[PDB]
Enzyme design. Sequence first.
Site, PDB file in Angstrom:
ATOM      1  N   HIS A  61       0.847  -1.212   0.000  1.00  0.00           N
ATOM      2  CA  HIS A  61       0.000   0.000   0.000  1.00  0.00           C
ATOM      3  C   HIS A  61       0.881   1.261   0.000  1.00  0.00           C
ATOM      4  O   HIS A  61       0.575   2.217  -0.739  1.00  0.00           O
ATOM      5  CB  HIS A  61      -0.929  -0.020   1.221  1.00  0.00           C
ATOM      6  CG  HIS A  61      -1.658  -1.300   1.333  1.00  0.00           C
ATOM      7  ND1 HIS A  61      -2.610  -1.707   0.373  1.00  0.00           N
ATOM      8  CD2 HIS A  61      -1.574  -2.281   2.268  1.00  0.00           C
ATOM      9  CE1 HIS A  61      -3.087  -2.894   0.733  1.00  0.00           C
ATOM     10  NE2 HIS A  61      -2.468  -3.265   1.888  1.00  0.00           N
ATOM     11  N   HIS A  91       4.927   7.015   7.012  1.00  0.00           N
ATOM     12  CA  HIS A  91       4.719   6.568   5.615  1.00  0.00           C
ATOM     13  C   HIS A  91       4.264   7.783   4.824  1.00  0.00           C
ATOM     14  O   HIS A  91       3.930   8.823   5.472  1.00  0.00           O
ATOM     15  CB  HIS A  91       3.735   5.399   5.567  1.00  0.00           C
ATOM     16  CG  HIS A  91       2.392   5.788   6.048  1.00  0.00           C
ATOM     17  ND1 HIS A  91       2.047   5.718   7.393  1.00  0.00           N
ATOM     18  CD2 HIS A  91       1.344   6.339   5.398  1.00  0.00           C
ATOM     19  CE1 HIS A  91       0.827   6.186   7.549  1.00  0.00           C
ATOM     20  NE2 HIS A  91       0.369   6.592   6.326  1.00  0.00           N
ATOM     21  N   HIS A  93       1.729   9.062   1.289  1.00  0.00           N
ATOM     22  CA  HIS A  93       0.803   8.870   0.146  1.00  0.00           C
ATOM     23  C   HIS A  93       1.243   9.832  -0.953  1.00  0.00           C
ATOM     24  O   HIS A  93       1.558  10.959  -0.613  1.00  0.00           O
ATOM     25  CB  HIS A  93      -0.644   9.162   0.585  1.00  0.00           C
ATOM     26  CG  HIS A  93      -1.030   8.450   1.828  1.00  0.00           C
ATOM     27  ND1 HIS A  93      -1.770   7.301   1.809  1.00  0.00           N
ATOM     28  CD2 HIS A  93      -0.699   8.672   3.109  1.00  0.00           C
ATOM     29  CE1 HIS A  93      -1.907   6.864   3.038  1.00  0.00           C
ATOM     30  NE2 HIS A  93      -1.288   7.695   3.851  1.00  0.00           N
ATOM     31  N   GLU A 103      -3.753  13.395   0.743  1.00  0.00           N
ATOM     32  CA  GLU A 103      -5.068  12.944   1.254  1.00  0.00           C
ATOM     33  C   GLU A 103      -5.865  14.181   1.681  1.00  0.00           C
ATOM     34  O   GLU A 103      -6.872  14.496   1.052  1.00  0.00           O
ATOM     35  CB  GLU A 103      -4.862  11.900   2.353  1.00  0.00           C
ATOM     36  CG  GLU A 103      -3.999  10.741   1.875  1.00  0.00           C
ATOM     37  CD  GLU A 103      -4.312   9.407   2.519  1.00  0.00           C
ATOM     38  OE1 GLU A 103      -4.037   9.292   3.708  1.00  0.00           O
ATOM     39  OE2 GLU A 103      -4.840   8.520   1.835  1.00  0.00           O
ATOM     40  N   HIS A 116       2.748  11.035   6.864  1.00  0.00           N
ATOM     41  CA  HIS A 116       1.971  10.677   8.084  1.00  0.00           C
ATOM     42  C   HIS A 116       2.922  10.079   9.117  1.00  0.00           C
ATOM     43  O   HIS A 116       3.378   8.966   8.909  1.00  0.00           O
ATOM     44  CB  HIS A 116       0.806   9.723   7.759  1.00  0.00           C
ATOM     45  CG  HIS A 116      -0.282  10.363   6.955  1.00  0.00           C
ATOM     46  ND1 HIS A 116      -1.232   9.649   6.283  1.00  0.00           N
ATOM     47  CD2 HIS A 116      -0.568  11.669   6.736  1.00  0.00           C
ATOM     48  CE1 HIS A 116      -2.081  10.471   5.731  1.00  0.00           C
ATOM     49  NE2 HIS A 116      -1.682  11.714   5.963  1.00  0.00           N
ATOM     50  N   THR A 195      -6.802   6.519   7.307  1.00  0.00           N
ATOM     51  CA  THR A 195      -7.176   6.759   5.884  1.00  0.00           C
ATOM     52  C   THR A 195      -7.059   5.471   5.047  1.00  0.00           C
ATOM     53  O   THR A 195      -7.331   5.533   3.853  1.00  0.00           O
ATOM     54  CB  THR A 195      -6.306   7.861   5.266  1.00  0.00           C
ATOM     55  OG1 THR A 195      -4.987   7.327   5.221  1.00  0.00           O
ATOM     56  CG2 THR A 195      -6.378   9.150   6.055  1.00  0.00           C
ATOM     57  N   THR A 196      -6.650   4.368   5.656  1.00  0.00           N
ATOM     58  CA  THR A 196      -6.631   3.014   5.042  1.00  0.00           C
ATOM     59  C   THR A 196      -7.412   2.078   5.953  1.00  0.00           C
ATOM     60  O   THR A 196      -7.425   2.277   7.162  1.00  0.00           O
ATOM     61  CB  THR A 196      -5.211   2.462   4.812  1.00  0.00           C
ATOM     62  OG1 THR A 196      -4.462   2.435   6.022  1.00  0.00           O
ATOM     63  CG2 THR A 196      -4.447   3.249   3.779  1.00  0.00           C
TER      64      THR A 196
HETATM   65  C1  LIG Z   1      -2.354   1.359  10.547  1.00  0.00           C
HETATM   66  O1  LIG Z   1      -1.474   1.145  11.395  1.00  0.00           O
HETATM   67  C2  LIG Z   1      -2.591   2.656  10.032  1.00  0.00           C
HETATM   68  C3  LIG Z   1      -3.525   2.945   9.035  1.00  0.00           C
HETATM   69  C4  LIG Z   1      -3.675   4.245   8.538  1.00  0.00           C
HETATM   70  C5  LIG Z   1      -2.858   5.274   9.025  1.00  0.00           C
HETATM   71  S1  LIG Z   1      -3.005   6.971   8.384  1.00  0.00           S
HETATM   72  N1  LIG Z   1      -2.951   6.898   6.754  1.00  0.00           N
HETATM   73  O2  LIG Z   1      -4.420   7.489   8.697  1.00  0.00           O
HETATM   74  O3  LIG Z   1      -1.842   7.766   8.998  1.00  0.00           O
HETATM   75  C6  LIG Z   1      -1.930   5.018  10.011  1.00  0.00           C
HETATM   76  C7  LIG Z   1      -1.792   3.722  10.494  1.00  0.00           C
HETATM   77 ZN   LIG Z   2      -1.258   7.635   5.894  1.00  0.00          ZN
HETATM   78 ZN   LIG Z   3      -2.730  -5.040   3.151  1.00  0.00          ZN
END
Ligand SMILES: *C(=O)c1ccc(S(N)(=O)=O)cc1
Ligand SMILES: [Zn+2]
Ligand SMILES: [Zn+2]
EC number: 4.2.1.1
Lengths: 257, 257
Positions: A61, A91, A93, A103, A116, A195-196
């Site tokens: 992802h 991470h 996007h 995002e 993020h 957001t995932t």
């Molecule tokens: C899972 O550890 C997870 C899923 C989404 C996000 S986000 N894209 O909202 O920073 C962080 C962690």
């Molecule tokens: Zn994220």
């Molecule tokens: Zn997966």
Amino acid sequence: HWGYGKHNGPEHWHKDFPIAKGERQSPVDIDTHTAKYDPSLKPLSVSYDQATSLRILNNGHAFNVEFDDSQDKAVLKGGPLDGTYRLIQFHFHWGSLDGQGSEHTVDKKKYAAELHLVHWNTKYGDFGKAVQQPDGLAVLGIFLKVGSAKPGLQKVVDVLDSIKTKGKSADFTNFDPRGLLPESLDYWTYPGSLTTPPLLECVTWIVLKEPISVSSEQVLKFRKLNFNGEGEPEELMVDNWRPAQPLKNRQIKASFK
Amino acid sequence: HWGYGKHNGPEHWHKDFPIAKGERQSPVDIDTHTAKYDPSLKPLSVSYDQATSLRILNNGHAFNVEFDDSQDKAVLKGGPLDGTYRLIQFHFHWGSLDGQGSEHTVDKKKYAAELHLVHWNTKYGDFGKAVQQPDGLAVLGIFLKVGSAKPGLQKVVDVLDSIKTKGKSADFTNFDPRGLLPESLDYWTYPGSLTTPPLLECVTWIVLKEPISVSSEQVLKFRKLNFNGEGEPEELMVDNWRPAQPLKNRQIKASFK
Ligand SMILES: *C(=O)c1ccc(S(N)(=O)=O)cc1
Ligand SMILES: [Zn+2]
Ligand SMILES: [Zn+2]
Ligand SMILES: *C(=O)c1ccc(S(N)(=O)=O)cc1
Ligand SMILES: [Zn+2]
Ligand SMILES: [Zn+2]
Ligand SMILES: [Zn+2]
Ligand SMILES: [Zn+2]
Ligand SMILES: [Zn+2]
Ligand SMILES: [Zn+2]
Ligand SMILES: [Zn+2]
Ligand SMILES: [Zn+2]
Ligand SMILES: [Zn+2]
Ligand SMILES: [Zn+2]
Ligand SMILES: [Zn+2]
Ligand SMILES: [Zn+2]
Ligand SMILES: [Zn+2]
């Protein structure tokens, strides 16, 4: 399995993750007409001096840089937060083109990418328990635009050939996440979600006003990662972003005038 | 993430997955003094003639051979079951040594490994809906002991180097699961659970009396798989078994005297 394709992307997530249609979904558009200054917001405290990076991985992802979160070595305090939030991973996007990737949006402007930094409330014992609580997570969101190279990004970009495909990782030590910050920590905050998938409504979002510059060479390396596993046909890891979700009843507060 | 290590193993699962201490957990010890003959139990009907194997994968816990389950090509009927149960996958649990590996035990004897053929009740439309129902799944359990080679296993063993690390998969077509069966379909049955998280109490267990023989060469190949992903330090995939759980009020029935 969910992704960002025609058939398994954000429009489809609701089928497998019902909370995708919840009351506090992220990201959102930040309209600077309604996201008002709040003088009651205490200053944000970022304490990253002793951050211990462990590993970088392609999860199919994005790519995650993971940190040692057994101690308060890299923590977020103050701003909208009660208590101590430990950095577990960061991470990005990003888009297929410079005009998209973020995002969050500001007055509907999309940035080239969004960083993020993910933190969890030490009140809850571990990450798995923290995601079940409205005050469980704090995600520091930073916009990326294309200009000058970000020197603090170079060490990340230089290892990405070693984790090109899904399920690969590498040892990734002595990475300083302070080198990914803008100059101002002025921010917007609102209650929201992952957001995932699983899209859990556990996040205090802290989105910085000031974007960082990355070079087109640095963002090009992001776009050369693969969604697919080694031995499968190449699917470029691009457009791994969820669009703006309905604000519904929520208040976006600004830390600045 | 849960696994079989000092800190994330069966002893610790209850901390993350409350159902681990539920009223119908698997596996169990089968005491042949109390697991009495039931003359009402119909013969078991195994109908695997048209089984369509698709792929084999290392999921970081075991390896799964997946089947086309869109039709009644490979089904379990009769014995304790109402209706038709479609084969979706098989996998094994095995030890670091020949003296352990099985999940179920017979008079406290552990076998070297245990094969699980996983089927779901066609009454419920798909696997995801079936796992939410007490009568949703039927797992055929077969004990492995070390002796003569199982010819029917050789095609599996020969592809394991190609899926050594977590996430790896391969095309795996025209595999005949009849080649993994013993001669007798005499069995024990009791209501139970998945033996891995999420440990859902959705399984009619059918455990065969007659173990199959595998060679020490065949079981050695199992022990050369990795729990870890590509780029992580090697952790041998061994001792991927949950010990006997409390029988509580459950009746184990024998199909035989
Ligand atoms: C899972 O550890 C997870 C899923 C989404 C996000 S986000 N894209 O909202 O920073 C962080 C962690
Ligand atoms: Zn994220
Ligand atoms: Zn997966
Ligand atoms: C998942 O679909 C799953 C989990 C556990 C088992 S077991 N070990 O109880 O056969 C089967 C399927
Ligand atoms: Zn729909
Ligand atoms: Zn779906
Ligand atoms: Zn406006
Ligand atoms: Zn500092
Ligand atoms: Zn940790
Ligand atoms: Zn300011
Ligand atoms: Zn490789
Ligand atoms: Zn405990
Ligand atoms: Zn735990
Ligand atoms: Zn936990
Ligand atoms: Zn006994
Ligand atoms: Zn898992
Ligand atoms: Zn199993």
